[PDB]
């Protein structure tokens, strides 16, 4: 895969 992006808060 390519371009896996996560923001968690």
What general form does the structure show? rod-shaped
Strand content: under 5%
Main beta-sheet annotation = none
Number of strands: 0
Radius of gyration over alpha carbons?
8 Å
Helix count from the secondary structure assignment: 0
Distance between the termini: 24 Å
Coarse structural class: little secondary structure
* Helix content percent band: under 10%
List the defining traits of the structure above.
rod-shaped; 9 residues; little secondary structure; monomer
How would you characterize this protein structure?
It is classed as protein fibril. Keywords: amyloid, MicroED, zinc finger, phasing, protein fibril. The assembly is monomeric. The entry is titled "MicroED structure of human zinc finger protein 292 segment (534-542) phased by ARCIMBOLDO-BORGES". It contains no helices and no strands. The chain has 9 residues and is largely without helices or strands. It is rod-shaped, with a radius of gyration of 8 Å.
Could you outline the blueprint of secondary structure elements for this entry?
Blueprint: no helix or strand
PDB class: protein fibril
Keywords: MicroED, phasing
Assembly: monomeric
Summary?
It is classed as protein fibril. This protein is largely without helices or strands and 9 residues long.
């Amino acid at each position: 895969f390519r371009n896996w992006q996560a923001y968690m808060q």
